[PDB]
Design a protein around this nucleic acid. Sequence first.
DNA 1: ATCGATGTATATATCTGACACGTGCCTGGAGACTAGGGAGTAATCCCCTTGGCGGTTAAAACGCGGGGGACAGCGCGTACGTGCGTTTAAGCGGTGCTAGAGCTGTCTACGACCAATTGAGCGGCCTCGGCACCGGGATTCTGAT
DNA 2: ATCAGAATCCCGGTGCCGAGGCCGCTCAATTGGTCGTAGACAGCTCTAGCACCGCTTAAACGCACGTACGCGCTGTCCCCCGCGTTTTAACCGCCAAGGGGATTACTCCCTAGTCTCCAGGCACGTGTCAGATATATACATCGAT
Lengths: 93, 94, 105, 103, 97, 97, 84, 78, 16
Amino acid sequence: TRKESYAIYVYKVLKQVHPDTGISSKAMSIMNSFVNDVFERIAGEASRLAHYNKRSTITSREIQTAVRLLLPGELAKHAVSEGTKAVTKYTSA
Amino acid sequence: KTRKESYAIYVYKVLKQVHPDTGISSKAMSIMNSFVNDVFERIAGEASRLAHYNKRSTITSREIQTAVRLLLPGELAKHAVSEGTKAVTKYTSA
Amino acid sequence: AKTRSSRAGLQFPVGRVHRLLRKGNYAERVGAGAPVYLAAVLEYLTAEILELAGNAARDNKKTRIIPRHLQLAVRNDEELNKLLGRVTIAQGGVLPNIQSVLLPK
Amino acid sequence: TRSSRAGLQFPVGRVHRLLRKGNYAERVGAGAPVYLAAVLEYLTAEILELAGNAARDNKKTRIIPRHLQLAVRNDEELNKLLGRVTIAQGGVLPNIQSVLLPK
Amino acid sequence: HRYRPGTVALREIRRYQKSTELLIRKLPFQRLVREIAQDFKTDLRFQSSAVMALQEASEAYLVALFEDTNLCAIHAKRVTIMPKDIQLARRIRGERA
Amino acid sequence: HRYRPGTVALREIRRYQKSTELLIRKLPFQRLVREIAQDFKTDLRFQSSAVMALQEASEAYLVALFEDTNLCAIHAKRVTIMPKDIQLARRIRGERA
Amino acid sequence: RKVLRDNIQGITKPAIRRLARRGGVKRISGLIYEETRGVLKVFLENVIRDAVTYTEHAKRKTVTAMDVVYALKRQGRTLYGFGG
Amino acid sequence: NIQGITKPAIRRLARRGGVKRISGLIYEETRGVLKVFLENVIRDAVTYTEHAKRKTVTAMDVVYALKRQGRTLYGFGG
Amino acid sequence: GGYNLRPRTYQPQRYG
DNA sequence: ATCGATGTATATATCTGACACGTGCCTGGAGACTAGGGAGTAATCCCCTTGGCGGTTAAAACGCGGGGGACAGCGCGTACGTGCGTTTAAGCGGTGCTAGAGCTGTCTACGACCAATTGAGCGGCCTCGGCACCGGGATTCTGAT
DNA sequence: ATCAGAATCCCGGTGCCGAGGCCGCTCAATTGGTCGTAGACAGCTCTAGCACCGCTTAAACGCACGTACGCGCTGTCCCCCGCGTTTTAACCGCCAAGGGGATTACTCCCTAGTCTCCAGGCACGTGTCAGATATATACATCGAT
Ligand SMILES: [Mn+2]
Ligand SMILES: [Mn+2]
Ligand SMILES: [Mn+2]
Ligand SMILES: [Mn+2]
């Protein structure tokens, strides 16, 4: 049965930060579980954000303000930097 | 002005059933209204994940019942399940 | 019977709970028995607290339930305390408790 | 693909679907999946950067769960983000209390 | 007339455990909130109930912390709470590393 | 020869804090899991990954508990952990009433 | 406007003392008062940082009671009596 | 059956926890604490299994139970 | 790559 | 500080299974396109937040004197660590059996969606009695003689 | 063992406003009908979990010794408590003004929805190098002298 994961995506990220390194199946599931947990934690905060403000849409602004609530200060500062960069680049292309 | 909803009338009905000669202050009623919304979100939130875990798109009385067993302590869950099952069968007959 | 709360023998509004579930982004569809069950559980827990708070209000020789009475009820019942272990009741105070080693002879 | 248009390695398309079928809101606006995919890609890059360093310090080329635990528990902020999280087969940091050492 | 050291403290413990009023003065606490919030973003206003909700939550946190702190002092065969009792309490309940 | 008491004890701490393997035998732990599960529902089966998931969480819970337990003993000017230290850690954690 | 300065000292020594009395504390060390001010400042920073973040997301200049209640619930310190 | 958690097994867990000297009554206190932990997690895991109408407790039921107990676990799915 | 990684990894100071 | 030795750490010789890659099938993502509503935006009223003043006084602050708790010192008893020899069971390799998990097809029971209907539920106004507040007095008890 | 200053408990009277009630306006829930798909069901399949076995051995076990750690007692020191007096500003009430929270009305663009096309992503299948294993040495290190 076709099961999905983030395995092929953390490899492409691993090869950009450390091209001459690998990762075991045990550590791969840990990375896979890490992405899903942070995905749910961010999307859950963004859901409450839209509900608190009587709005029906989760846009990039709800994702940003959810990152500032969940990630620690120095991690959140660079995450917004990565988020805002990809959005403006996605709009230009 | 703005029409703001609340559980004030329904908490006041239950209070008179239990203590007919007892009232509640504005602050205490706000605390009760905060209690209901919290438990509402907890139960509905757990029932929401129960449907997602089983690839379902419907929150029925079975999901809410399972959410009660997970959240409420021992005796509270046993009685709350008795109240819900009694109500849902009474609702089906009418 | 007209309202869905009367068909279920409940005091809490089944119609309002049904709307909140649908407009709360919990699932794509909501069963007909979910708001009945949930409003019944919310009525039982509300009754359980108002029973103990009313007694506390009577023990303090008062007619109206204040936040203090809600605190004495929750914190003295083990089951309610576990349910609200990470909850703060405004103007509730604390339970009278003094450690034994602090007491004189 | 929307991942290349955003310059991301993580699937912008898969994130957009998971936001829809996750019952987070009635509608999911564009850019929100590319923003979230970029944030998830950044955080994975931050952990793999510090875990890969832990592997090189432990004289290994493949990252094991131990290298992930060393990378998170030694970073002040990854430890705070993953405070209530247990990493399997990660062990603990070497920490002996000073009053337990001999004189 | 003079009371022995300890009888007035135990009297105050009984006094403030029977009551529910806030123990921090309103105006000093409100200025502290505005000062801390001003460092996050300037030109901020507060609803009167928003500050009260902060004081209701802060005082309830400190009282609960003073309980776990008192247990740490009694655990070390002491009656006085010391800064190391507060830090141990904050470490065990997960607020510190 | 013979090592003084506490010499190899610190050696074991450095040995087990350096490794990541499980420290409880898997079969006695698996029988304990099936015994407790039998009291909630009968005729239950367990996946291999399901039992290993419980063991990874149970050991990581206890190891973190001994870290808090050890700090309570040091707080009382002791180096031996005692039941009163575990009870204080779980009380401050909020697990024990 | 007036410049706010050194308001952590507003939490006087007797105010910290009353909070400890309600906590069932008999004797108090002299260094507790500065430690409590540091703990409270750290507590207020985390709650206000999230509260004003909700205020910023709502495009408002006023911190509402709901902003504080939503923030306390995030921290795991749910509060009753002010909304929600 | 609870005695399967032997004394040297508890000592190894404490050694990883940085404990140098262990009392005698710790082992019976540890078995009771471990039992209360497994009781709370397996109760929720079986609840997830009963809701799925299954007779085999899967690893996801364990991961879901640990999550709501505040003991989130990585590496076993989810 | 294009990741704006923070250059400093501070160690969390623990009790004792 | 010196010396014998004891467990630990490094080296490199060789073996194996998990990793990383390759192949092709396929299903979810993307491009093209229509429809409507959520919300962006400009307009507007009034709620309530901020600011200031003084009269009042409970509370904060500082200093005094000493009682009792912090804690360092210390002796005694014993509980726990180290370790050698005895007993137990778990881990591994290998095989057999089927419960049950899972996946594919089929039909209806159920719930989203929509339009006309109407009273449950809310805000606004009103009134008194629960209880907050003031001041008198009876009781308890802790500390002095 | 007695007696007085303190605080707390308490008792009647008084005055203020918040709760509980009434009334009528409005919006959300009820009613009834159709459409469509999720979910319940049944049949087939095969994966995974369970069961039984005996060999080698690492692990649990138990006993024995003697240490040094836990803990009870003492005594010295000074810190923190209780209190009177002086100082400070919180609290209350009352007023001013404007900014921004909340309601409101109109146009659109952004996204859900549907359809056709195709490659990104996954199962599988297989070879190879990372690393698990280990023996002998190297060396960091503890206890006896
Ligand atoms: Mn400032
Ligand atoms: Mn020397
Ligand atoms: Mn609108
Ligand atoms: Mn204006």
